[PDB]
Amino acid sequence: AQSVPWGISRVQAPAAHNRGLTGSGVKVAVLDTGISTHPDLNIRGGASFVPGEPSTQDGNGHGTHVAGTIAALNNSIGVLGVAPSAELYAVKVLGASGSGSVSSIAQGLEWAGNNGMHVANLSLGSPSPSATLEQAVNSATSRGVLVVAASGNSGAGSISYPARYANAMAVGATDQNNNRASFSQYGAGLDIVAPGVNVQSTYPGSTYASLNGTSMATPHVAGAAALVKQKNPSWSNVQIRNHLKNTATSLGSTNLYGSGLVNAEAATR
Ligand SMILES: [Ca+2]
Ligand SMILES: [Ca+2]
Numbered sequence: 001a002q003s004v005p006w007g008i009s010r011v012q013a014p015a016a017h018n019r020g021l022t023g024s025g026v027k028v029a030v031l032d033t034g035i036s037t038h039p040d041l042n043i044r045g046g047a048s049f050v051p052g053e054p055s056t057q058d059g060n061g062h063g064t065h066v067a068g069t070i071a072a073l074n075n076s077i078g079v080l081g082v083a084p085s086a087e088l089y090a091v092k093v094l095g096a097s098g099s100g101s102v103s104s105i106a107q108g109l110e111w112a113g114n115n116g117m118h119v120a121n122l123s124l125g126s127p128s129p130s131a132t133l134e135q136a137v138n139s140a141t142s143r144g145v146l147v148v149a150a151s152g153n154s155g156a157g158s159i160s161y162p163a164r165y166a167n168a169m170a171v172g173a174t175d176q177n178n179n180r181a182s183f184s185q186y187g188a189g190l191d192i193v194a195p196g197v198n199v200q201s202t203y204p205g206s207t208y209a210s211l212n213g214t215s216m217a218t219p220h221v222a223g224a225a226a227l228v229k230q231k232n233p234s235w236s237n238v239q240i241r242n243h244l245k246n247t248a249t250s251l252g253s254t255n256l257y258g259s260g261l262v263n264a265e266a267a268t269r
Contacts, residue, residue, distance in 0.1 A: 004080050006176065007069070007195030011220050012265035013082040016227045017074065021268050023083025023226035025233070028070055028119040029145075030219075031108040032063030033098060035090035036204040040078035041067055046090030047115075049107040050100055059096030061204050065211055066123045068202030069219035070226070079201055079208060082223025082264060083230075089117065094124060105162075106136035113143030118229050118237075121222040122149040122168070123215030125160030133162050141167040146237035148222045150214035152185040157255070164189045169225075169241050172257065173197065173217035180256050184214055190258040191241070192248055194220035224264045231268050243267055 004014065016022075027044075035043050036058040046056040058064045067088060074084035093108040094100040105124065112120040120140060137147050151172040152160030163170035166189070173184040173196025180186060181197050196217035203209035221244065228240045235243075245259035247266035 002076055002078060002080060005200045007199050007220055008080055008082060010195050011082060011224060011262050013223065015265035016268045019268060021227045021230050022074070023071065023086035023223065023230055026083065026086050026119065026226040026229045027089060027117045028083065028086045028121065028222055028226050029089040029091045029112045029117045030063055030067045030070065031091045031093045031105060031120055031122050032066050032124065033060035033094045033096065034058035034063045034092040035067045035088070036064045038064060038202050038206055040072045040202050042073060042088060043090050044087045046092070047111050048092035049104040050092050050095045053092060053095050056090035056092050058204055060098050061209070062098060062123070062215065063090070064204050065201040065209065066121060066215060066219045069199060069216060070121060070223040072202050082220055083226035086223065086226045102130040102132045106132050109136035109140040109147070112145050113140040117145050119146045119148060119222050119225045121219050122147060122162060123218045125150055125152045125163055127160055129161050134165055137162050137165050137167050141237060144237055146225050146240055148218055148225065150218040151190055153183040153213050154185055155183050156185050157187040159185045159187055159189050169221065171214060171218045171221045173214045174251070174261060178251050178261060186256045192221055192245055192258045192262050193217060193251065193260065194262045221262050224262050224267060227264050228267050
């Protein structure tokens with residue numbers, strides 16, 4: 001039996017699926033700890049930029065979980081992604097410990113821009129800026145990639161990098177009441193929010209697990225972007241980003257929530 005995690009329903013992905021929108025034909029890179037082979041995922045390719053971890057399989061769990069929020073397959077098992085037919089790519093930029101470098105992340109962004117990705121999900125961040133990272137965000141953006149990044153989990157009223165950069169779409173986390181999760185960073189540069197508390201997804205060992213974080217919110221938006229791109233193949237990264245924001249549900253101030261809660265039904269109507 002398949003279940004629909006609450007956040008998938010909260011962002012109204014099933015209504016998009018009912019209109020024939022699944023993310024088919026849209027390439028989404030998950031820049032994370034890898035993605036493990038799993039019967040509820042279809043991994044089309046990828047690359048590793050972590051020295052000593054040449055495989056794109058996930059030694060941590062985080063990247064597999066993020067990937068399933070984007071694209072867990074629509075079938076009779078497991079869970080269901082926002083964009084269950086997205087073309088999913090495992091871009092390992094963080095190792096099994098959950099960390100990498102600005103250089104490995106930049107290499108994954110350049111890979112995305114050189115390999116035809118439409119969306120790159122970066123459920124990762126640091127409090128400090130990086131010239132290396134910014135250059136790669138801008139390069140990927142010039143190549144048509146919509147870079148979607150997590151605001152961070154410190155609870156502060158400023159957001160992490162690379163989410164802070166203008167050419168990243170920064171995503172914070174909400175709870176089941178449509179309040180900002182206490183940990184979700186906010187402030188200047190925040191674009192949108194999505195569910196990030198008690199989010200069940202695919203996990204290594206061919207299982208399913210729940211996590212909290214802005215890392216869990218981010219893939220809801222990356223998946224919604226893929227639905228919008230399937231509906232509107234001619235659109236640019238900027239057009240998709242703007243439409244997701246313009247169709248989000250206001251939840252409060254722009255400083256706490258950006259444009260508000262992503263709404264895949266309104267974005268694909
Ligand atoms: Ca499934
Ligand atoms: Ca931003």
